[PDB]
Amino acid sequence: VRGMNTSSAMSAFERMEEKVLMQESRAQALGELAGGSDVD
Amino acid sequence: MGLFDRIKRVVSSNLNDLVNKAEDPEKMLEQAILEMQEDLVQLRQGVAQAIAAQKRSEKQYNDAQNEINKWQRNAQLALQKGDENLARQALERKKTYTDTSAALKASLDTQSTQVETLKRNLIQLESKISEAKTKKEMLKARITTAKAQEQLQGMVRGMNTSSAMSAFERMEEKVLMQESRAQALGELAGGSDVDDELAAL
Amino acid sequence: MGLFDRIKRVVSSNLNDLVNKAEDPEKMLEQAILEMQEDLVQLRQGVAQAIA
Amino acid sequence: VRGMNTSSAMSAFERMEEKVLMQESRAQALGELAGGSDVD
């Protein structure tokens, strides 16, 4: 399960998952920072 | 609080951050999956032993049941050949087998329930590992999305995250400066009249 | 969790990905088949003893 | 059997099988990405 750390394998898996999500969030924020009615 | 506790907390907080920098997502995801599967394999064998023990218990139950009828047949053979002595003695002994049959079936039932629960758990674990194996590919897709978006931002004029854009903009500015030099040199050393025709037509 | 466990997990995750890059399908398929057949041969002999 | 890894030979065989299927899927996706009533 996501929220418990009894197993080392899940610990590592979730840690890498969070690292990658953070990296993508960094990319998105950098996108924002530097910068359908009509077709409806 | 203490002092040795504090020193060891500092040393640990340094070593852990040293390690967490070496971890690389693309490889540790696979390593986690590999160990996941190893553990599942080692659980299969426990389930197998449970099943084998159930087979043994049912076989014992069947054999006791068969001996019950065997001794009933022995009683009938006594009735055919012998007398009431052997005929009654056969059932006298058959008492024990009738007892043991139920005494064993009671536990055989619980054993069966346990084996069923174990099989269910094994299937659940297989499903969850498959889900994780899909999540790994989804995470790789996210990595690619991140790198693509970072590529796009490097294309904007005012930021220097990408070396290619750095060089491109540098040459652009150099050339604009050269043209400005030419224009200034032009100035340094050195439409009302034709708008009248617009009145003609 | 532990620390030595974590270090060894990192080292293992590196060596395994190093090896999995060397594997080439066209050859490892044949190698797997070859060992498959070897095992079958070694089982024939057990069956033969049973028959004898 | 496909889903269990008790034998090393099968482990390797299935691993190569999945690698090749993934390679073919890559080719097909690359085909899509870059781009019978009438004869009935």
Numbering used by the authors:
A (entry chain A), D (entry chain A): 156 to 190, 203 to 207
B (entry chain A): 1 to 190, 203 to 213
C (entry chain A): 1 to 52
Sentences reproduced from the published study:
The ESCRT-III-like protein Vipp1 couples filament polymerization with membrane remodeling. PspA activity is triggered by agents that threaten inner membrane integrity, including phage, mislocalized secretins, and antibiotics, whereas Vipp1 is a plastid component in cyanobacteria, algae, and plants, in which it functions in thylakoid membrane biogenesis and repair. Given that two-dimensional (2D) planar sheets share a close geometric relationship with helical lattices, and as a means of understanding the interconnectedness of Vipp1 polymers including rings, spirals and planar sheets, we determined the structure of four Vipp1 helical filaments by cryo-EM.
Overall, Vipp1F197K/L200K_L1 and Vipp1L1 subunits were in similar conformations and assembled using equivalent helical lattices. However, owing to the Vipp1F197K/L200K mutation, interface 3 formation was inhibited, with no supporting map and build for helix α5N. The key difference between the Vipp1F197K/L200K_L1 and Vipp1L1 maps was the presence of lipid bilayer in the central lumen of Vipp1F197K/L200K_L1. Concurrently, the outer leaflet filled the space between the helix α0 stacks. Analysis of the Vipp1F197K/L200K_L1 electrostatic surface potential showed that amphipathic helix α0 was positively charged, with basic residues positioned to attract negatively charged lipid headgroups. In Vipp1F197K/L200K_L1, the ESCRT-III-like protofilaments were rotated ~43° to the membrane tube axis while maintaining similar lateral interactions and ultrastructure by undergoing filament twisting.
